[PDB]
């Protein structure tokens, strides 16, 4: 299953971009199609994305009017246009295929490694985490009752210069491929994963995230930059 996203793009104030991704290898119309951005040194915005068999789409709410998300099955691509470009619309735009595997069918996730276009609620996390290697460390992620204490939690590792993975999902799944040295957890309207023995691989920022029914949009957490210190 793979995501290629259109070249990196500079572009003028107040003119719009279409930024497109292709996926191959999989059932197309069986997946949800999500495009999450990142302005450069911050965390995670989710703008919207469409719903399979309907073929609706839907947005977050500072970018209505601005945003038009639409897919070709035909060809497997799903584009993004954002109109109206202010400066604080540079970031690097993200395209996800959300879905369900083929035989045990749970929940699943792959990002696009993102178009870089040149020209706000959150979850909260604390900023910062370490370690030394071996030891355990604990992030938190802390909401209110319409996102973590009514809906399921995901958690996204992000490596340097990299797009978020999914690390956790349904408050404490781990996809193949995860390790069990990380684990999921979540009470009330408070969550939290744990790393045990830790390794200098796990350097990352941390993102907890999960639906909203008041807002009825997607959240993410503020990201704890998790620092393996030598040794
Ligand atoms: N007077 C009116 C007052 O009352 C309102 C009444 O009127 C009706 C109110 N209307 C509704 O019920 C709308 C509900 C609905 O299904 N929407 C369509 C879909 C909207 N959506 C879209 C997207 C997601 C999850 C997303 S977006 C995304 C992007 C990147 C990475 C992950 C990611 N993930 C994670 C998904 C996994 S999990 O599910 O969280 O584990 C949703 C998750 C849950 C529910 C809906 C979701």
């Known amino acids: 299953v793979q995501l290629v996203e259109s070249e990196a793009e500079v572009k003028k104030p107040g003119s719009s971009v279409k930024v497109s991704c292709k996926a191959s290898?999989?059932?197309?119309?069986?997946?949800?199609i999500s495009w999450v951005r990142q302005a450069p040194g911050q965390g995670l915005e989710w703008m919207g994305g469409?719903?399979?068999?309907?073929?609706?789409?839907d947005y977050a709410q500072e970018f209505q009017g601005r945003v038009t998300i639409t897919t070709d099955e035909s060809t497997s691509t799903a584009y993004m246009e954002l109109s109206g470009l202010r400066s604080e619309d540079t970031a690097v735009y993200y395209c996800?295929?959300?879905?369900?595997?083929?035989?045990?069918?749970?929940?699943?996730?792959?990002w696009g490694q993102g178009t870089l276009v040149t020209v706000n609620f959150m979850l909260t996390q604390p900023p910062s985490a370490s370690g030394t290697p071996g030891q355990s460390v604990t992030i938190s992620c802390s909401g209110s009752?319409?996102?973590?204490?009514?809906?399921?939690v995901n958690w996204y590792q992000q490596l340097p210069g990299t797009a978020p993975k999914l690390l956790i999902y349904?408050?404490?799944q781990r996809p193949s491929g995860v390790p069990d040295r990380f684990s999921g957890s979540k009470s009330g309207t408070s969550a939290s994963l744990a790393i045990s023995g830790l390794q200098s691989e796990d350097e990352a920022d941390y993102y907890c995230?999960?639906?909203?029914?008041?807002?009825?949009?997607?959240?993410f957490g503020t990201g704890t930059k998790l620092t393996v210190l030598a040794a």
């Open positions: 996800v295929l959300l879905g369900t595997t083929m035989v045990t069918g749970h929940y699943f996730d792959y």
């Open positions: 290898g999989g059932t197309f119309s069986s997946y949800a």
């Open positions: 469409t719903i399979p068999i309907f073929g609706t789409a």
């Open positions: 009752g319409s996102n973590i204490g009514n809906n399921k």
């Open positions: 349904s408050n404490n």
């Open positions: 995230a999960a639906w909203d029914d008041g807002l009825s949009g997607y959240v």
